[PDB]
Amino acid sequence: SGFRKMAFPSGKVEGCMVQVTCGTTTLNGLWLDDVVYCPRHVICTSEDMLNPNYEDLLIRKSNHNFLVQAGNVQLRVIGHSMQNCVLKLKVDTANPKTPKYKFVRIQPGQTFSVLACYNGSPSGVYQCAMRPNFTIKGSFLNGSCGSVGFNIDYDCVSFCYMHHMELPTGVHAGTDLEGNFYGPFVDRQTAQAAGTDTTITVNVLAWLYAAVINGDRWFLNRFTTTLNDFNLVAMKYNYEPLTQDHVDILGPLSAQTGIAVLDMCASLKELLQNGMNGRTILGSALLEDEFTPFDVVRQCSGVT
């Protein structure tokens, strides 16, 4: 037992991190097969970021201007193209460590692991969620752009995120591996404010189920509620509305614990209305929303 904010093992993704340099700018690239993926802002100076015309800035770049280094060995760049906000650099060598992989675009509320990198080298791994306002709250310093977010299904790495930007509020923005930004964000040094960061209700309920499985039961009460009644409270507390799809997804956790989904909603409702009163749930003093119901099942069963 015990329940932790766990990230996927990062080895398969570490084998893909390379360093990409264009002019004075160095960031991270993802090397899969004979292609290196990186944020297109690698071609910009700090001055260009205010109002970059990426197509025009890219005409001045040739294959030899993109320096790609995998560990301490240089990769030969034989092609380059821009797909949305990422550059795809064709190299003459397939990455020998390329794992089985997919490029997926996740939904808000979904979680993933980030392998934070600097100069193509991994610094650490942590678990994130795509917020309902399409930002992530990561740990990213200068040089961390090009670090990726991913999930793993046994031996297949599903890449879902590539880091590009830090908003003036300290939150993070990026793209899927096709270069499309999550949310309305653009790769330009301009006023971009995030919308309401609501709480991922289905994730909190999944985490309440993990708490019951792992022995933290104080918050369980004698009440029940309905989806409509719960959602009035959820609205008031800036929580995502709960749908019948969410109830269905929580079905296995409900079955394993014997606590009906709406009963757990009534427990959550009282926690919202009354607070924790100085108590904790799974070592946290706030309601955690960065575990999906699939993460809870995975961790509570021991999936590898």
Ligand X SMILES: C[C@@]1(C(=O)Nc2nncn2C2CC2)CCOc2ccccc21
Active site residues: 41, 145
The minimum distance between CB 140 and ligand X, in angstroms, equals 4
28 binds ligand X per the rule CB under 6 A: no
98 binds its own copies per the rule CB under 8 A: no
Pairing status of strand 156-166 against strand 100-103? parallel
2 binds its own copies per the rule CB under 8 A: yes
189 binds ligand X per the rule CB under 6 A: yes
Length reported for the chain? 304
Residues 144-183 that bind its own copies (CB under 8 A): 144, 166, 170-172
256 binds its own copies per the rule CB under 8 A: no
Q: Binding residue for its own copies (CB under 8 A) from 100, 102, 137, 217?
A: 137
The minimum distance between CB 141 and ligand X, in angstroms, equals 5
Say if CB 261 and CB 250 are below 8 A apart.
yes
The minimum distance between CB 80 and ligand X, in angstroms, equals 19
Which of 190, 243 has the CB closer to ligand X?
Answer: 190
Calpha distance 35→77 (Å, rounded) = 9
Calpha distance 167→135 (Å, rounded) = 9
Size of the site for its own copies (CB under 8 A): 54
Instruction: Provide the residue type at 207 as one letter.
Output: W
Q: Binding residue for ligand X (CB under 6 A) from 19, 113, 135, 144?
A: 144
- Count the alpha carbons within 13 Å of 186 in the hemisphere toward its beta carbon: 11
The binder of 41, among its own copies, ligand X, none, by C-beta within 5 to 8 A per type, is ligand X
Which of 255, 286 has the CB closer to its own copies?
Answer: 286
Judge residue 293's burial from the number of C-beta atoms within 10 Å of its C-beta, 0-12 exposed, 13-18 middle, 19 or more buried: buried
Calpha distance 127→138 (Å, rounded) = 9
Q: What are the backbone angles phi and psi of residue 199, rounded to the nearest 5°?
A: -85, 135
List CB contacts of 79: < 8 A, sequence separation 6 or more: 63, 89, 90
Say if CB 200 and CB 109 are below 8 A apart.
yes
* Edge-first strand listing for the sheet containing 66-70: 73-75, 66-70, 17-22, 25-32, 35-39, 86-91, 77-83
Stretch that binds its own copies, among 33-41, 99-107, 115-123, 233-241 (CB under 8 A): 115-123
Instruction: Provide the residue type at 298 as one letter.
Output: R
216 binds ligand X per the rule CB under 6 A: no
Stretch that binds ligand X, among 30-38, 139-147, 196-204, 209-217 (CB under 6 A): 139-147
Q: Around Cβ 194, how many Cβ atoms within 10 Å? A: 18
The binder of 283, among ligand X, its own copies, none, by C-beta within 5 to 8 A per type, is its own copies
Tell me which residues touch ligand X (CB under 6 A). 1, 41, 49, 140-142, 144-145, 164-166, 172, 187-189
| Interacting residue ranges for its own copies, rule: CB under 8 A | 1-12, 14-15, 115-119, 121-126, 137-144, 166, 170-172, 214-215, 275-276, 278, 280, 283-286, 298-304
